[PDB]
Amino acid sequence: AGDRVSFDLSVRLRGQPTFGDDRVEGKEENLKFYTDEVIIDQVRHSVSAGGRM
Amino acid sequence: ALIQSDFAQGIRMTPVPDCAGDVTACRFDITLKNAPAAGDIIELGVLPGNAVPVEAILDVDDLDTGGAPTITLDVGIMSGPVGKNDPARTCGNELFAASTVGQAGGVVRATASSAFRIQKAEDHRSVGVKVAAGPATGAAGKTIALILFYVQGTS
């Protein structure tokens, strides 16, 4: 049971690396995500093969 | 003349951070045996391999006991390797420029724009104070002490 569906995209990490013998601990990359949502609804229609005459 | 501190010789090992961007600080101090006079390149302490000063706090005892004292301390980076007892070593005016800490024994912090712009190096550079102007009446056994706030791994 659910009215929406959300699905994620994980883009590349794009930080500058550490050159030489400089310490790297603490300058840690943060993964970035993006989200999109899909909303469901009903789509109905009707036809009248109507009349008895 | 070179008046070498404990850290410059290497008897006291200076602290170095491990995490990048961490701030470390050990107070670099000496006990002046004689009275300071112009030309003394006091090698107060050492800045480790990959580090840049972020804040420098210079405190001294009253280093001049004369009316209108003229003693001034210049703090900077020095050229050659640490611990080399060669008079052919020059100081710098980066951390402090003609500061007047020693006139009244106060405490001042890094107030020069060039202090925090020091670029990295790969080898251990030595931070040494030079008395640009000789005191009117030098003091016998007062102490000059720096405090460096340096960070490793800056970009």
Query: For residue A50, with 0-12 CB atoms within 10 Å meaning exposed, 13-18 middle and 19 or more buried, which class applies?
Result: exposed
The type of residue at B60 is V
Sheet strand arrangement including B41-47: B41-47, B125-133, B72-77
CA–chain centroid gap for B1, Å, is 15
How many Cβ atoms from other residues are within 10 Å of residue A1's Cβ? 2
User: What's the CA angle centered on B89, arms B151 and B106, to 5 degrees?
Assistant: 60
> Concatenated DSSP letters for B60-122?
E---B-SSS---EEEEEE-SS-TT---S-----SSS-SSB-STTTT-EEE---TTGGGPPP-S
Interface subset of B 65-104, CB within 8 angstroms of A: none
Residue A50 makes CB contacts below 8 A (sequence gap 6+) with none
Contact status of B15 with chain A (Cβ, < 8 Å): no
Residue B22 vs residues A14, B56, B78, B92, B152: alpha-carbon distances, Å: 23, 16, 24, 25, 7
Residues B108/B17, Cβ–Cβ less than 8 Å: no
Resolution of the experimental model in angstroms, please?
A: 3.7
Q: Is B138 left (phi over 0), alpha (psi -120 to 50) or beta?
A: beta
Could you give the 3-state DSSP secondary structure of residue A20?
Answer: coil
Residues B61/B29, Cβ–Cβ less than 8 Å: no
Distance CA B148, CA B93 (A): 15
Contacts for B5-14 with beta carbons within 8 Å, 24 or more apart? B5/B29, B5/B30, B5/B42, B5/B43, B5/B44, B5/B45, B6/B30, B7/B44, B7/B45, B7/B46, B8/B43, B8/B44, B8/B45, B8/B46, B8/B82, B8/B83, B8/B126, B8/B128, B9/B83, B10/B82, B10/B83, B14/B45, B14/B46, B14/B48
Interface subset of A 11-30, CB within 8 angstroms of B: 16, 18, 20-27
Nearest C-alpha in B relative to A25: B19
Distance, in angstroms, between B153 CA and closest chain A CA? Answer: 4
Distance CA B138, CA B103 (A): 11
Cβ <8 Å between B19 and A23: yes
Measured between its terminal Cα atoms, the distance across chain A in Å is: 45
